[PDB]
Amino acid sequence: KMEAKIDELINNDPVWSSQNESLISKPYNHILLKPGKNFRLNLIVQINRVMNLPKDQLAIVSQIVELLHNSSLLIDDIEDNAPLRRGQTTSHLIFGVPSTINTANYMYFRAMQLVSQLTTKEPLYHNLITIFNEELINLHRGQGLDIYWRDFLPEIIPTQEMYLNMVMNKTGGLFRLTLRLMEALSPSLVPFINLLGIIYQIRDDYLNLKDEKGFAEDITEGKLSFPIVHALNFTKTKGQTEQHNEILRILLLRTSDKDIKLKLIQILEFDTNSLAYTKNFINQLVNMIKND
Amino acid sequence: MEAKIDELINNDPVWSSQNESLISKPYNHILLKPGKNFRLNLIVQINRVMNLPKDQLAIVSQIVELLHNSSLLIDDIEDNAPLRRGQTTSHLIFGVPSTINTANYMYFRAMQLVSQLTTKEPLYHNLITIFNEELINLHRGQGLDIYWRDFLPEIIPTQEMYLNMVMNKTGGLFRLTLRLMEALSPSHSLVPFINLLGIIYQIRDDYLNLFAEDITEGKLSFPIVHALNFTKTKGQTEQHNEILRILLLRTSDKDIKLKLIQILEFDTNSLAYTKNFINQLVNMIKND
Ligand SMILES: CC(C)=CCC/C(C)=C/CC/C(C)=C/CC/C(C)=C/COP(=O)(O)OP(=O)(O)O
Ligand SMILES: CC(C)=CCC/C(C)=C/CC/C(C)=C/CC/C(C)=C/COP(=O)(O)OP(=O)(O)O
């Protein structure tokens, strides 16, 4: 009797009830509650004017990008110890870091599974899987560097050039993934999508300081954001020792003190002019398209 | 400026050998102590009948070694384990952020190795599908294990629930290995056998754990599951509740740990129940 139950278990595919699906989906369902700006989704609709994928294929590509985007935020908020995401408590503080890590990773592989419902043309299929794998590798390479510079500061002080190659991997990754899949499926805008990704990341960095995640949470997180990279390299270059050191000291506190965060922003505004430099840099990238 | 940007966006992302070493640090750390290599030695034994060519067999081994070691990095973060293979866990040295990312990164470097197994598009499709299905099963198994543990005492798993979970959590990488080998073989499936091997392997691991860190971690191990269900069934409220209180302490007190280990040994006889259950499983194969 014990034997037959073991036999039945080992001789059949692993069983998975919808009740269990609901238990381990909690972390992800929570983040779905507040949709974001849907910038990537709208980007997908627009781009389809030229690519012309059938409604059904397009829905799958959208689902894949939404799964990857949202799960990547679940992981990034654990990796940054972020208290808020889209104005609500982050999933890992509600369900725990362990379940949130496993759920986000599980969703990466469900996104992978959807890639098969895109086609049966073995030539195409292979190319699709390859695009997915390459860009998931690129995403993790960039995320890995961003995380390393932040957690081991001041071991490595990146240069503007180093930051830009990191963003090409980290932020450029899902934008290139989306576009490469759609382009592969069309009955090249990658360079434009790379620039768009760089502008998106630097702008996010800029706005987090200029201005829901909390007041300037990138400082509390110790991030080597575009403005900070400019500030540290500017102070190094000009021999501004006291301030170079104060920028590093503040980043290392991982502080939520609102006055210390503003102190740091004012050093960028008045001592290194890092805010004006970043605002200008963004406009210079945007003009490359406006002047195309 | 415009020129530099132009070259950046028109080229593949820049990634160096040094960058690769920086992000590999947490993985390289756990590979400093080999472990027993049960899975890779298993692969060799099984190839005696699968006869894969040495180069494909090596890629299967690499895929399995990357998944096994990256899964340990993640499992250790998920139960905040202080030690793995006699040394400090990677996340306590490189931090949780870098260790999550590196382990997740290696999951995809393992995926990439699957297209190096074959050029035949029919077979490739099959291999990728096998990899995808079992990574899904592994996460369903690991998510239930984590769920029951972190949500205790909401759900006390039964013996059958534990067995289904373990077949995915631990049996999952054993099945991936064998499915990939059977798919590639140039020569009856061994999946039922490997599923039972995975189950025995985990129950045996739970048994041996009893540092008894599974206690400090609040784990619903095979012996604990037997003890909780045993006490419930017999109306032994006090013992049932005592086992739960100790698990819920997430204690590092050796004295309190010994106390639970004795309840399991002398009051519920879970250690003996466990040992005999393993033997019953081993005979299921032997006596065949
Ligand atoms: C699976 C993926 C995509 C990545 C794996 C590796 C990881 C965790 C990378 C982190 C990638 C990341 C979070 C980059 C930052 C991109 C960015 C600016 C996100 C925020 O985009 P919004 O459009 O502002 O967010 P909403 O959806 O709330 O509007
Ligand atoms: C990518 C994979 C495999 C899974 C994804 C989801 C996760 C993180 C699952 C957890 C899987 C896990 C760690 C199961 C336990 C397996 C086990 C009993 C490991 C210990 O095996 P040993 O053979 O004693 O280890 P050594 O390598 O040190 O010898």
Deposited resolution, Å: 1.8
Q: Copy the structure tokens of residue B106.
A: 């290696």
Among all bound ligands, the one having the nearest atom to the CA of B139 is 2
Please indicate whether, in this complex, the C-beta atoms of A11 and B109 are within 8 angstroms of each other: no
Q: Phi-psi category of A44—alpha, beta or left, where left has phi over 0 and alpha has psi -120 to 50?
A: alpha
> Beta-carbon neighbour count of residue A281 at 10 Å?
21
Torsion of CA B235, B238, B242, B248, to 10 degrees: 70
Q: Distance between CA atoms of B207 and A102, rounded to whole angstroms?
A: 25
Q: Which residues contact B23 (CB under 8 A, 6 or more apart)?
A: A140, A141, A144, A145, A148, B98, B101, B102, B105
The count of residues in chain B is 288
Q: Distance between CA atoms of A113 and B129, rounded to whole angstroms?
A: 8
Point out the annotated binding site of B for dimethylallyl diphosphate.
84, 169-170, 202, 209, 219
Residues of B in contact with A108 (CB under 8 A): 104, 107
Among all bound ligands, the one having the nearest atom to the CA of A75 is 1
Q: Distance between CA atoms of B65 and B57, rounded to whole angstroms?
A: 12
> Beta-carbon neighbour count of residue B244 at 10 Å?
17
Residue whose entry in the numeric block shows the structure tokens 């490469």: A180
Q: Which of A14, A109, A122 sits opposite B135 (nearest CB)?
A: A109
Q: Phi-psi category of A249—alpha, beta or left, where left has phi over 0 and alpha has psi -120 to 50?
A: alpha
Radius of gyration for chain A, computed over Cα atoms and rounded to the nearest angstrom: 22
Q: Is the peptide bond before B34 cis (omega within 30 degrees of 0)?
A: no
The upper half-sphere exposure of residue B198, i.e. CA atoms within 13 Å in the direction of its Cβ, equals 29
CATH classification of the domain holding B23: 1.10.600.10
Q: What is the DSSP string of B212-231?
A: -HHHHTT---HHHHHHHHHH
Q: Phi-psi category of A214—alpha, beta or left, where left has phi over 0 and alpha has psi -120 to 50?
A: left
The upper half-sphere exposure of residue A151, i.e. CA atoms within 13 Å in the direction of its Cβ, equals 21
- Under a CB-based contact definition with an 8 Å cutoff, are residues A137 and B113 in contact? no
Q: Which residues contact B147 (CB under 8 A, 6 or more apart)?
A: A23, A24, A99, B155
Assign A60 to helix, strand or coil: helix
Q: Distance between CA atoms of A42 and A116, rounded to whole angstroms?
A: 23
Amino acid (one-letter) located at A113 = Q
Residue whose entry in the numeric block shows the structure tokens 């007190």: B253
Assign B84 to helix, strand or coil: strand
- Under a CB-based contact definition with an 8 Å cutoff, are residues B214 and B250 in contact? no
Q: Is the peptide bond before A154 cis (omega within 30 degrees of 0)?
A: yes
A263 annotated ligand-binding residue: no
Q: What is the DSSP string of A123-170?
A: HHHHHHHHHHHHHHHHHHHHHHHHHHHHHTTTS----HHHHHHHHHHH
Q: Which residues contact B275 (CB under 8 A, 6 or more apart)?
A: B207
Q: Copy the structure tokens of residue A38.
A: 């849907």
Q: Distance between CA atoms of B58 and B152, rounded to whole angstroms?
A: 42
Q: Which residues contact A105 (CB under 8 A, 6 or more apart)?
A: A71, A75, B74, B104, B107, B139
Determination technique for this PDB entry? X-ray
Number of helices followed by number of strands (H, E) in chain A: 15, 2
- Ligand 2 neighbour B36 (Cβ under 6 A): yes
Exposed/middle/buried for residue A270 (C-beta within 10 Å: 0-12, 13-18, 19+)? exposed
Q: What is the DSSP letter of B210?
A: -
Could you tell me which residues are beta bridge partners of residue B87? B84
- Under a CB-based contact definition with an 8 Å cutoff, are residues B91 and B77 in contact? yes
The upper half-sphere exposure of residue A21, i.e. CA atoms within 13 Å in the direction of its Cβ, equals 7
Q: Copy the structure tokens of residue A77.
A: 């908020």
Could you tell me which residues are beta bridge partners of residue B135? none
Q: Distance between CA atoms of A176 and A197, rounded to whole angstroms?
A: 9
Residue whose entry in the numeric block shows the structure tokens 């899975």: B39
Q: Distance between CA atoms of A192 and A172, rounded to whole angstroms?
A: 10
Q: Copy the structure tokens of residue A185.
A: 């499926």
> Beta-carbon neighbour count of residue B265 at 10 Å?
15
> Beta-carbon neighbour count of residue A204 at 10 Å?
13
Amino acid (one-letter) located at B200 = I
A37 annotated ligand-binding residue: yes
Q: Distance between CA atoms of B69 and B66, rounded to whole angstroms?
A: 5
What separation in Å is there between the alpha carbon of A76 and the centre of ligand 1? 8
Assign A97 to helix, strand or coil: helix
H-helix or E-strand spanning residue B128: helix B121-150
Amino acid (one-letter) located at A145 = L
Distance linking the first and last C-alpha atoms of chain A: 75
Q: Distance between CA atoms of A104 and A117, rounded to whole angstroms?
A: 21
- Under a CB-based contact definition with an 8 Å cutoff, are residues A171 and B143 in contact? no
Best residue of A3, A9, A128 to probe chain B, by most B CBs closer than 10 Å: A9
Interior CA angle at B176 toward B175 and B181, to 5°? 95
CA nearest B99 in A: which residue? A144
Q: Distance between CA atoms of A232 and A254, rounded to whole angstroms?
A: 17
Q: Copy the structure tokens of residue A10.
A: 């080992």
What separation in Å is there between the alpha carbon of B74 and the centre of ligand 2? 9
H-helix or E-strand spanning residue A47: helix A39-51
Distance linking the first and last C-alpha atoms of chain B: 73
- Residue of A35, A36, A39, A27 lying closest to A90 (CA atoms): A27
Q: Distance between CA atoms of A44 and A52, rounded to whole angstroms?
A: 11
Residue whose entry in the numeric block shows the structure tokens 């990634």: B15
The upper half-sphere exposure of residue A163, i.e. CA atoms within 13 Å in the direction of its Cβ, equals 21
- Under a CB-based contact definition with an 8 Å cutoff, are residues A65 and A40 in contact? yes
What are the distances in angstroms from CA B123 to CA A130, A232, B116, B180? 15, 52, 12, 10
- Under a CB-based contact definition with an 8 Å cutoff, are residues A27 and A91 in contact? yes
Strand residue runs (E) in chain A: 84-85, 88-89
What are the distances in angstroms from CA A82 to CA A77, A250, B249? 5, 18, 27
Q: Distance between CA atoms of B157 and B152, rounded to whole angstroms?
A: 10
Radius of gyration for chain B, computed over Cα atoms and rounded to the nearest angstrom: 22
Q: Which residues contact B159 (CB under 8 A, 6 or more apart)?
A: B225, B226, B229
A69 annotated ligand-binding residue: yes
Q: Distance between CA atoms of B90 and B273, rounded to whole angstroms?
A: 35
Amino acid (one-letter) located at A104 = A
> Beta-carbon neighbour count of residue A96 at 10 Å?
20
Q: Copy the structure tokens of residue A1.
A: 């009797």
Exposed/middle/buried for residue A269 (C-beta within 10 Å: 0-12, 13-18, 19+)? middle
Q: Distance between CA atoms of B76 and B89, rounded to whole angstroms?
A: 7
Assign A171 to helix, strand or coil: coil
Domain that holds residue A74: 1-292
Residue whose entry in the numeric block shows the structure tokens 């997430």: B250
What's the structural domain count of chain A? 1
Amino acid (one-letter) located at A71 = S
> Beta-carbon neighbour count of residue B34 at 10 Å?
9
- Residue of B139, B113, B140 lying closest to B128 (CA atoms): B113
Q: Distance between CA atoms of A44 and A48, rounded to whole angstroms?
A: 6
Q: Which residues contact B125 (CB under 8 A, 6 or more apart)?
A: A122, A125, A126
Q: Distance between CA atoms of B19 and A289, rounded to whole angstroms?
A: 31
Residues of A in contact with B78 (CB under 8 A): 97-98, 101-102
- Under a CB-based contact definition with an 8 Å cutoff, are residues A41 and A62 in contact? yes
Q: Distance between CA atoms of A158 and A145, rounded to whole angstroms?
A: 10
What are the distances in angstroms from CA B96 to CA A92, A208, A218, A252, A253? 13, 24, 18, 17, 18
Assign B95 to helix, strand or coil: coil
Q: Copy the structure tokens of residue B9.
A: 């966006």
Q: What is the DSSP string of B134-180?
A: HHHHHHHHHHHHHHHHHTTTS----HHHHHHHHHHHTHHHHHHHHHH
Exposed/middle/buried for residue A291 (C-beta within 10 Å: 0-12, 13-18, 19+)? exposed
Amino acid (one-letter) located at B6 = D
Residue whose entry in the numeric block shows the structure tokens 């197994």: B117
